[PDB]
Amino acid sequence: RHKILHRLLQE
């Protein structure tokens, strides 16, 4: 469920 994209975006 887009865990990498979530992480890139909140970084």
Add this chain to the structure above:
Amino acid sequence: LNPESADLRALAKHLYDSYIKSFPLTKAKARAILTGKTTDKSPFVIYDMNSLMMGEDKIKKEVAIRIFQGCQFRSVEAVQEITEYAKSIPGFVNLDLNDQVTLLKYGVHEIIYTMLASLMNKDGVLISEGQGFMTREFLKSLRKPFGDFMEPKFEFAVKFNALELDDSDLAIFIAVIILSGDRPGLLNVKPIEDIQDNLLQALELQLKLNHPESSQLFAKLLQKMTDLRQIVTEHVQLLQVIKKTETDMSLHPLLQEIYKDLY
């Protein structure tokens, strides 16, 4: 001109600076490398399987798959760079985080093929940050269906490159793509369209100022936004085919995230 213009100029400059910071190899440097108008070392040319192995030194089992896998590392870094760039687009990080995800998920590919054109000519494409030049014929020659991946991106690139955009134009164009209100599954379209309306105005002023002799460049460029969507759909179908007929290969998890339920 007026203070409405001025806000749109300031947006253009903000996006351009952020573009420069987010993307190491700009269209400016890329064209210098490709024309020869830089006077430092040329890229290593890869035109066949022999040149590919010999070049394995200067760029970082079956070759098609080796190229496939290296292409994944590059894509993943492109997505990272594009994400950083998006976060600099005024208003973007204030959207619902789920909508931020949806916009990137659908937008990154369209930006990738936009910016890949900066790296292309009719004969081949710079790879590995300007250190390699892989020929178009060599990519067509790869065994089916791998020889099908790049050719549509070259055909797009040759027409797109004729518009002669520079980095300062591309910076706004790519922000316009990301802030598309018609992506599947968006929760709250209005704030997205409010930002895109502004970016589109900024794009239009940029093109009038930076290409004053080139009328309807704004309209020609908007029509390419639909060409980019066709490339993406055709690309995702080819990826489906590969996923079925090359059971052994594995797709990077970032790329799985993006392509999933977009197939």
